[PDB]
Scaffold this active site. Structure first.
Site, PDB file in Angstrom:
ATOM      1  N   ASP B 351       0.832  -1.185   0.000  1.00 12.46           N
ATOM      2  CA  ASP B 351       0.000   0.000   0.000  1.00 12.46           C
ATOM      3  C   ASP B 351       0.868   1.236   0.000  1.00 12.46           C
ATOM      4  OD1 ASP B 351      -2.857  -0.810   0.108  1.00 12.46           O
ATOM      5  OD2 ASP B 351      -2.259  -1.800   1.986  1.00 12.46           O
ATOM      6  N   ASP B 703      -4.580  -3.519   6.044  1.00  9.48           N
ATOM      7  CA  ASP B 703      -5.155  -3.933   7.307  1.00  9.48           C
ATOM      8  C   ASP B 703      -6.648  -3.621   7.340  1.00  9.48           C
ATOM      9  OD1 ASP B 703      -5.006  -1.040   7.770  1.00  9.48           O
ATOM     10  OD2 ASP B 703      -4.985  -1.476   9.926  1.00  9.48           O
ATOM     11  N   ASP B 707     -10.176  -6.300   4.956  1.00  9.94           N
ATOM     12  CA  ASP B 707      -8.932  -6.456   4.232  1.00  9.94           C
ATOM     13  C   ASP B 707      -8.234  -7.758   4.642  1.00  9.94           C
ATOM     14  OD1 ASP B 707      -8.123  -4.122   2.428  1.00  9.94           O
ATOM     15  OD2 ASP B 707      -6.157  -4.795   3.177  1.00  9.94           O
TER      16      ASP B 707
END
Ligand SMILES: C/C=C(/C)C(=O)O[C@H]1C(C)=C2[C@H]([C@@H]1OC(=O)CCCCCCC)[C@@](C)(OC(C)=O)C[C@H](OC(=O)CCC)[C@@]1(O)[C@H]2OC(=O)[C@@]1(C)O
Lengths: 994, 994
Positions: B351, B703, B707
């Protein structure tokens, strides 16, 4: 080393090759020393303090507690919170008891002396020896003497080793061979040799035994042996060889821990197998460490519950007291545990002289010849009153007093008695009674003349102390005593050579006064004296004499007969070799009979019935005496050991006859015989050997080191108070009064003691049984533990302790001596009794549990969790099965524990009352039969409360309970036990037993 | 149940038919409950302790040993003599290992937590509901709520279920929808409906999700769904659906036992077929039972010989250590086995915000309008220094500082930034640094005004903590903030209504400060502000603005552009419906552009090269970010994911574009793409779905429960340290530093770990191979068994164990990251390596045999039975082939065994040195390259001796050997192995490999 009382003086100096004049060369010393060894007994006492304390940690029971103290110790280390330190009480307690235990076990071994340790106290520190490396007398260490070198001893000296005497430089040599036997009467030694190679030390008249004392004179000889090879050393070896078995109680008491241990390990395996949940349902969760402690938390309370600790303390308070008791009965038990083995006494072997009898010799009969003819002979029977040695008494014929001076034969008879005697009298001041100086059998012969008074010597003019030897001193003037041929077991007789008092140089007028056993003496008389006249000796007069000896010997009035003769024409003074004991008998030949005298060794007043008791008690008594088999049997018949008219042919043997029989017939005769006469040396042991092959708890008596091996093998060796120390230190008891009866006296008290013990021992492991059950339910029904080791402890140590102790004081059951001896095999708990406590146990073990489970469920005022399903959990990790609430730790409440704990206490105080008798209801056996019991019971109870309200205590143990309908549950939940008991107690009528 | 964020409040009360005022009738509760079900997730953890231990006995290997423990167990039961009890060691050992095995397998599952288990920890215990059977608020159990009934929630409450909101009674409703995403920033809910039936929870602004928290206010609504039907429940179902495959090692390692098992059964069949004597010659005789044991005696030593037990223990000591290692690298691997799958990382999906970048927002550029005319427009570019949030910095034009107050447009621009912001600042004490309170992107906007300071407010007079919001508080006075129209992904903009401070009652003078994404906002401005003056909006000035947004957005200096406008003449205050988020965009119309600001999310220092490494390591990295595809690509180009000037048309997609493509083209793009922008919800899973259809070991990051499904499907799901717990508990690793690089960091360490493992794994089953051969000759050449299970055991457990462990510490081979990732298919042993150990094995398997057969035959000092023909017999039942003799049992001598056993040990200690590298001679690969190896080797050896002389041990294993020319045979019979090795080791030059 050389056992040689048989080799001559030459043959001995030969064997060792030494010079009596020079001695051993400094070389031979080294050579011999290294050949034989240091002349001393192996000193051993390797009982180190360390090992000592350890020895006090081999007993499974004390061991189980140890492993039980660990868990506890580690369980108090694995807890969360600031009060996790208050958990170290429990362990510290245990360990403390384990410690106080060891302490005591070590404080006894400190003073616990043995007999072998005593022998070492008999061999001197230094000795006089003549080595060839000098001339003077060098006094080396008694430890450094060796066989072979020449030694010297004189008065006061303690013979350092086994010494063959070479030359007696003093006029005569005398020794105190007391430590061996006890007969303080010194003995006369010689140099001539002894033929019989295997002769008793008693007949080794030319040897000096180590441990002995040189009473008179001074001589020198050659050391034949040393160390544990000497007469004493042998005995010390025999003693160190005897395996002393453990008291039967100790045995029984031991197997118990052996079994208890086993059981416990079974309860554990069972428990796990009971609650096999986690091993079949519980997922991961987290109650895996908690469900662990619990299982261990109950093991420690599984040990302290089973282990009847505190019992030993009881068995001891009991024994000690029992001991100090017998003490007042002239019975001194040394080994505390023996007070038990005592009461199991199967057989008793007691010595006649001094135990069975008083040993207060006294001449009461005496016959001289009246006249002889063609087979027509008459005697002159007599009688003399006088139990004691005091001259108090008068001679009398036909029950009518006569004057001794009126009979010739009685004046001479009185001569010998006086001149052939070697003892004196004396009037004690403090005691103001006539005391004896010398041999008993002699002093009596003295007392005889002191009565007869064949010379009418004014004595009412002399004090009590003065006329102590009146009629004697007078006869001591008529004849001047030259020398004396000492008595010997050989010719079993004694003489004394002496001449007149108005003499010059002239052959004629010498007399020899012989004093011995009828058999020999008489067999050496060729003439009979008829007053002043003397005539030959014939079959008639002879038999007319002997027979009476038999009358008097085996007759009802058991007497010791001593023959008196005199040699009229002895051999020329300068023709006697006063050094060859062998030549004495020949010198004492061609004698002239003068009379006979009968003595008496009065059977102790008390022995009379004491023998009877043993017959009632099924306790056999075998008499060991030095009396001839003949008079021996008679004496037995007189004390009741034998039926006045029963056949005892195969029930009485002589030391001789005994050895004649083969070990087969030997061992037999021991279970039947009751009278051994002229018993050999190693015979008390032989007898104890056999009386044991029949599992009979034997009692042996006697003293002297040459008598210790037997007092050690017997189940209860017995020593006299006046006995030797080796004997005493080598015995179970010490008859202070040396009076046989005292044995029976004690034997009984032993029976009484083991009876009351047998109770409290049952009362005690009984609570344990119940206790375990309790700890076993709580383990199956997962209930919070009703009881904790801490409490349980205070229980079996105090609450139960006292009643245990009082239960020893149970009045002595009668009909005690009317039953055979307790079989050692007889167990404390079996059959019905097993099942009985099996129940009384199950009951309390269950009652206790529910006595707390009630405080939870049916609880009147409290966490009334009625049928909460405690058996299901103590989880509360969920807290969901319990809808609304913010507290669950209540479970660990002190009220329920103290409930059970109080329940236990109540039950036991009662069960301590169901113990005053095995199978008897309390209505016939009132609790007030044993006050000490009802008493302790109160101190036991107020103690229970003392640890419930006294601020400190109720903290560590548990909380208290209010009279507010609390205790009533206790009582209504306990008392019924008595019913259960009483029911099962007298349920024996329907089974024919009582 | 009713997925309805689209149905209106009425339509909903309709569907379920309920009264918002009364509620569901006690009946409908039952009806609905039984229709839908209890509102809770299926609780499951059915892993019973029993089944647990059993699960640890399904693996053929551990099973083979079992059957091998039986025979052994029964072979020690069938023996004659008193020493037949010393035969229970062997079996007890085995079983013990089998037990200790299970123990461990059970002690992990106890603490082995799963993520699904975590969700249950998100749904509350109780909830407030309004049933029609009452009036007040009854708080039933969150487990008992049902779709349909009306609920209530207020601050602090945890939303019990999926709730459609009916009425918000507080002024505004706010919620912490963190557990779903992680953005702690509370959100504002509404009651109006959401048209799109298939909208992301993010756009469901009128729903309340179970597991969520009522940040602000209190409202009531109607439960639309419960249980595993709710947003969370769905995810929990998806997670419980993913099939997590076994580590590739585990697979490879598994087939091995599958094969080993097979082989073993082949050796057995072979053996029998080898010695087919009795089945062709032996008559009846009697050696039929003996010739049986032998055959079984060698099976147990056939298993323990083949089964490389002890290896698992090694792979573990290794992993653990490797694990605690990475730990210090801010990398936390939860699943021990993953440390392996890690190093095989094919692709990585990380990410942007917070991993690739630091997430320390900062405004660095900002342009306002300068002047406009007939297509002639000028701007006002700016710059501001200040990486951190601290006010430390200065605005500057043409690199030269200017005073903000000098430009009108910058004072207003600064107005909005302050009044349209909703974040605060604060100076930390402990850290003494400026901390951020609120949205990152806002705090920065705040920091901007804190710098510009358009009003010259004295701050050098206020502390560090004081001027925390100086220039801000000042602007907070100029305008009184009435209300605010919260940002929405819809009009992608935000506003705030407020009026002056010296006002009464009067229409005019109200302002609306709009803050949003350039696109929309700008598209809603009809006027441009030129300082104080304002003029219309035209193509010129407009494009002149947009373009620059592009410059700043895709340009090298990647920035986030935020447009700032203000509504001058807003609608009458009493004309706005502050409850219809839909009406906000219209309210925010006819705007006046005021400026633009560029931000920066600084790419982590470390990621810079970490990306490079992955290119070297052939590890692909796909970036998932919420940035528009436009700026997204640019950011990639900036971190190297993309070539500064390469075409990425078909290598970067947006969540939208992605769905547009068919599953055919969909799966394709996944093997090529490296940048996904505005990624949809169920996309990380879609991507992991595909990246897996190409057998690529994928790494995913992110997270939040919404997810977790993806972090579970990936070969190595990755969670941030600061991430949610569901995520963490649902991941393979936990980047403590949330810094991407830490991934690469670990990935490498994984490669290093599996390399050293791959060695000791080979070193270990190698000894096994040889071992078997040994046990296979002894079976053909009927020789007494050279080796026993007992020894063999101590071998593969200790002697070999240590070198195995040290062999993990082999220094990390360089050129580690310059090679593509290890193919999961790649076997541990094949080709030449196969044949190599095939030889090294045959050698030792033969050497060992003859290392004992030598002690028999060519024996220097011993039963020198030179060519005795041992292959012929061990009968001696005849004893005739051996003329004279009275002993034959010599055969079972401990010298020959210990010979072979020592031989094995010698060989292995060496073969453990031939392992420090696959194809490298020890002359280039010195044994001292790995000291821990040379070290263990010594402890391995002294151990061997430790079990040969230490009295106890040499008893159970075997006898010792003297330095007396004994060991020399050992060495001269072992060492050559190295030669064999080294020869075959670098025999690869002649085969082009290295
Ligand atoms: C201390 C406490 C306990 C519980 C103990 O283990 O005692 C056993 C045991 C070892 C024996 C037994 C006990 O046996 C049981 O209680 C059976 C198991 C039931 C418990 C399970 C839980 C529900 C004694 C205690 O009790 C009863 C009531 O039957 C009596 C006696 O003990 C004595 O005579 C010793 C006195 C010194 C012995 O049968 C004895 O075994 C023997 O060899 C003896 C002869 O010793």
């Amino acid at each position: 080393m050389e056992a040689a009382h048989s080799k001559s003086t030459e043959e001995c100096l030969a064997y060792f090759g030494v010079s009596e004049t020079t001695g051993l060369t400094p070389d031979q010393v080294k050579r011999h020393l290294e050949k034989y060894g240091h002349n001393e007994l192996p000193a051993e006492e390797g009982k180190s303090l360390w090992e000592l304390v350890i020895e006090q940690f081999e007993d499974l029971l004390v061991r189980i507690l140890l492993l039980a103290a660990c868990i506890s110790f580690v369980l108090a280390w694995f807890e969360e919170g600031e009060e996790t330190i208050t958990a170290f009480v429990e362990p510290f307690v245990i360990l403390l008891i384990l410690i106080a235990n060891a302490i005591v076990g070590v404080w006894q071994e400190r003073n616990a002396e043995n007999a072998i340790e005593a022998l070492k106290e008999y061999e001197p520190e230094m000795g006089k020896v003549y080595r060839a490396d000098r001339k003077s007398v060098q006094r080396i260490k008694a430890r450094d003497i060796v066989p072979g070198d020449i030694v010297e001893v004189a008065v006061g000296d303690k013979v350092p080793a086994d010494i063959r005497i070479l030359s007696i430089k003093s006029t005569t040599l005398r020794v105190d061979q007391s430590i061996l036997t006890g007969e303080s009467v010194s003995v006369i030694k010689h140099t001539e040799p002894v033929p019989d190679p295997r002769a008793v030390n008693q007949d080794k008249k030319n040897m000096l035994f180590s441990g002995t004392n040189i009473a008179a004179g001074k001589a020198l000889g050659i050391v034949a042996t040393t160390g544990v090879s000497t007469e004493i050393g042998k005995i010390r070896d025999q003693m160190a060889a005897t395996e002393q078995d453990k008291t039967p109680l100790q045995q029984k008491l031991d197997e118990f821990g052996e079994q208890l241990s086993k059981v416990i390990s079974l309860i554990c395996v069972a428990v796990w197998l009971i609650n096999i949940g986690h091993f079949n349902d519980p997922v991961h969760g987290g109650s895996w460490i908690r469900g662990a402690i619990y299982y261990f938390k109950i093991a420690v309370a599984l040990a302290v519950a089973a282990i009847p600790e505190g019992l030993p303390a009881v068995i001891t308070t009991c024994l000690a007291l029992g001991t100090r008791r017998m003490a007042k009965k002239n019975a001194i038990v040394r080994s505390l545990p023996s007070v038990e083995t005592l009461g199991c006494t199967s057989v008793i072997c007691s010595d006649k002289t001094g135990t069975l009898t008083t040993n207060q010799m006294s001449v009461c009969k005496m016959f001289i010849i009246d006249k002889v003819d063609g087979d027509f002979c008459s005697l002159n029977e007599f009688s003399i009153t006088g139990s004691t040695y005091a001259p108090e008494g008068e001679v009398l014929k036909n029950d009518k007093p006569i004057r001794s001076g009126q009979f010739d034969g009685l004046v001479e008879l009185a001569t010998i008695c006086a001149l052939c005697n070697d003892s004196s009298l004396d009037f004690n001041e403090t005691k103001g009674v006539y005391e004896k100086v010398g041999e008993a059998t002699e002093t009596a012969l003295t007392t005889l003349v002191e009565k007869m008074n064949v010379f009418n010597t004014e004595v009412r003019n002399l004090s009590k102390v003065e006329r102590a030897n009146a009629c004697n001193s007078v006869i001591r003037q008529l004849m001047k005593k030259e020398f004396t041929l000492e008595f010997s077991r050989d010719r079993k007789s004694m003489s004394v050579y002496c001449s007149p008092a108005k003499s010059s140089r002239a052959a004629v007028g010498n007399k020899m006064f012989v004093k011995g056993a009828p058999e020999g003496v008489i067999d050496r008389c060729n003439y009979v004296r008829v007053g002043t006249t003397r005539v030959p000796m014939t079959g008639p007069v002879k038999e007319k004499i002997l027979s009476v000896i038999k009358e008097w010997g085996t007759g009802r009035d058991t007497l010791r007969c001593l023959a008196l003769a005199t040699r009229d024409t002895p051999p020329k003074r300068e023709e006697m070799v006063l050094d060859d004991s062998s030549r004495f008998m020949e010198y004492e030949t061609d004698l002239t009979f003068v009379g006979v005298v009968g003595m008496l060794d009065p059977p102790r007043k008390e022995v009379m019935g004491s023998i009877q008791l043993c017959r009632d008690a099924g306790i056999r008594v075998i008499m060991i005496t030095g009396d001839n088999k003949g008079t021996a049997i008679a004496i037995c018949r007189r004390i009741g050991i034998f039926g006045e008219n029963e056949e005892v042919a195969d029930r009485a043997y002589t030391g001789r006859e005994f050895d004649d029989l083969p070990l087969a017939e030997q061992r037999e005769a021991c279970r039947r015989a009751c009278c051994f006469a002229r018993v050999e040396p190693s015979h008390k042991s032989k007898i104890v050997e056999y009386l044991q092959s029949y599992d009979e708890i034997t009692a042996m008596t006697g003293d002297g080191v040459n008598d210790a091996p037997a007092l050690k093998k017997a189940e209860i060796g017995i020593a006299m108070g006046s006995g030797t120390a080796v004997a005493k230190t080598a015995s179970e008891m010490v008859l202070a009064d040396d009076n046989f009866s005292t044995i029976v006296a004690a034997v009984e008290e032993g029976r009484a003691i083991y009876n009351n013990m047998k109770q409290f021992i049952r009362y005690l492991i009984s609570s344990n049984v119940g206790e375990v059950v309790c700890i076993f339910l709580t383990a199956a029904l997962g209930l919070p533990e009703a009881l904790i080791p801490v409490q349980l402890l205070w229980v079996n140590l105090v609450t139960d302790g006292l009643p245990a102790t009082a239960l020893g004081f149970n009045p002595p059951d009668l009909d005690i001596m009317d039953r055979p001896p307790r079989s050692p095999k007889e167990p404390l708990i079996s059959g019905w009794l097993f099942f009985r406590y099996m129940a009384i146990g199950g009951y309390v073990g269950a009652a206790t549990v529910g006595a707390a489970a009630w405080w939870f469920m049916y609880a009147e005022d409290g966490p009334g969790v009625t049928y909460h399903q405690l058996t299901h959990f103590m989880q509360c990790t969920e807290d969901h099965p319990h809808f609304e609430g913010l507290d669950c730790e209540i479970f660990e409440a002190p009220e329920p524990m103290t409930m059970a704990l109080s329940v236990l206490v109540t039950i036991e105080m009662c069960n301590a009352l169901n113990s005053l008798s095995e199978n008897q209801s309390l209505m016939r056996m009132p609790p007030w039969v044993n006050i000490w019991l009802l008493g302790s019971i109160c101190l036991s109870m107020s103690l229970h409360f003392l640890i419930l309200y006294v601020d400190p205590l109720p903290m560590i143990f548990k909380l208290k309970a209010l009279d507010l309908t609390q205790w009533l549950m206790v009582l209504k939940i306990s008392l019924p036990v008595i019913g259960l008991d009483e029911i099962l107690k007298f349920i024996a009528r329907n089974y024919l037993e009582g």
